[PDB]
């Protein structure tokens, strides 16, 4: 056996067919006896899927800092008619919202979830693997576009 750190690409060098049955590598390497013990449950019962559901997908639970009346007025009159020299920020609550989301992706950390953080790493790539196998044609097209862009 080779005891150096695991490569994630090993499937490309070896002609083993159980590989291609699953997306990510550590699940390709998984014995059948263990794969038997993964049980099918709703996608949000996967703690990472839960995290994704709460933070990203649920807008309704997102609260924004409420604007004062002065702020409401200055903002409105900025939006409707532009006069130069003004504060360049005037940030759309759309931009703000998307900033809060992207920093929610920043602040997401994995680990033991009896400690602080929401997800095991294994938990995360597990949801990821279930999802990558789950892709349609236009699904993985959207994926590859997303990948080419970012």
């Amino acid at each position: 056996k080779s005891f150096d750190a695991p490569q994630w690409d090993l499937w490309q060098s070896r002609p083993r067919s159980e590989d291609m049955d699953e997306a990510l590598q550590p699940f390709m390497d998984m014995p059948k006896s263990l794969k038997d013990r993964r049980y099918d449950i709703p996608w949000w019962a996967n703690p990472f899927g839960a995290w994704y559901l709460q933070n990203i997908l649920s807008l309704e639970l997102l609260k924004l800092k409420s604007k004062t009346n002065a702020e409401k007025i200055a903002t409105y009159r900025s939006y409707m008619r532009s006069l130069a020299s003004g504060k360049d920020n005037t940030m759309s609550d759309d931009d703000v919202i998307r900033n809060i989301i992207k920093e929610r992706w920043k602040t997401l950390e994995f680990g033991d979830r009896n400690a602080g953080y929401p997800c095991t790493f294994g938990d995360y790539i597990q949801f990821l693997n279930e999802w990558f196998k789950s892709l349609d044609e236009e699904g993985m097209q959207r994926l590859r576009e997303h990948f080419d862009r970012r």
Binding site: L64, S92, I97
Partner: protein, 48 residues
Amino acid sequence: AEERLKELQRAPFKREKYVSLIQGKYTPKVKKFGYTQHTTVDDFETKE
């Protein structure tokens, strides 16, 4: 007739308030120019 039936079934919804379900949202959403989502103009679009 089908589309008009759809309008009528959704007609009581059109009489209520607009309210953001993100509370603390004020600034309007931008709808850009030429996006297919936003085109209201039917030049020749008949039932046919």
